[PDB]
């Protein structure tokens, strides 16, 4: 009725960079901060207007790369200067065949796009 | 590309043996090669790694000492040379090379994490037998 605000809502992946208080006035703002490795996006900062939060953003996941199924689909990392056992979001892995396989003339380029979680991983076949 | 392995076949315990691997095909001159080994249902072992750019070398554990990596570059070649041999270096033995610029032997397929690694091209492989 004077337009305060509750606590600002959670995001997974990420928390507010200020102390938590139970009641913010009009106007005041949070900024949100995603954990290591997570990719912020959208609104860095949310306000209390009127009683209610701007939207929160989202903290995308990096891709962790799987033995198993790097395994199951004969290909492993390739060796790079740089490529780590996961990716932050945006950055392409890239995959060479086992010893012995080709890439399945069905796949996707051994090179492939990190997206919030998930990798399209490419396939290879015995020659 | 193609790499073809020589030098391997049976030796006495503490005999040695010279691994030859000769790469043709090659377009940069930046590159890594290395040389893993395979027993029949253990998992495959990086024994060696040499970089024709930054001259970085590597090792296993279990051969360090014993062998030396050296690469020839107007044959287009690297050798491992492989003395003090015991049967538990008995494998085939793959060469293999990875062309992406700048690579620090002892990471990636060397390291740790190696079961997450791979080459961009392998050798047929060829068979080491140290009888006790």
């Known amino acids: 009725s004077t337009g305060k605000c509750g606590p600002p809502p959670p995001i997974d992946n990420g928390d507010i960079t200020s102390f938590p208080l139970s009641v913010y006035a009009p106007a005041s703002s949070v900024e949100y901060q995603c954990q290591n490795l997570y990719q912020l996006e959208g609104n860095k900062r949310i306000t209390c207007r009127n009683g209610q939060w701007s939207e929160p953003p989202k903290c995308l996941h990096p891709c962790v790369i799987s033995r198993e199924i790097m395994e199951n689909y004969n290909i492993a990392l390739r060796w790079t200067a740089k490529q780590k056992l996961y990716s932050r979001t945006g950055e392409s892995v890239e995959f060479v065949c086992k010893r012995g396989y080709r890439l399945s003339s069905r796949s996707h380029t051994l090179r492939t796009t990190c997206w919030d979680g998930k990798l399209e991983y490419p396939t290879c076949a015995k020659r | 590309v193609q790499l073809v392995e020589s030098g391997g076949g049976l030796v006495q315990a503490g005999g040695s043996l010279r691994l030859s691997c000769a790469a043709s095909?090659?377009?940069?001159?930046?590159?890594?090669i290395g040389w893993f080994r395979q027993a029949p249902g253990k998992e495959r072992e990086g024994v060696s790694c040499?970089?024709?750019?930054?001259?970085?070398?590597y090792y296993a554990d279990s051969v360090k000492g014993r062998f030396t990596i050296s690469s020839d570059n107007a044959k287009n070649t690297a050798y491992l040379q492989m003395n003090s041999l015991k049967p538990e270096d008995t494998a085939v033995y793959y060469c293999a090379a990875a062309v992406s610029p700048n690579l620090e032997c002892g990471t990636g397929p060397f390291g740790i994490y190696a079961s997450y690694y791979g080459m961009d091209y392998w050798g047929q492989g060829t068979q080491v037998t140290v009888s006790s």
């Open positions: 040499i970089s024709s750019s930054n001259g970085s070398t």
């Open positions: 095909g090659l377009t940069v001159d930046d590159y890594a």
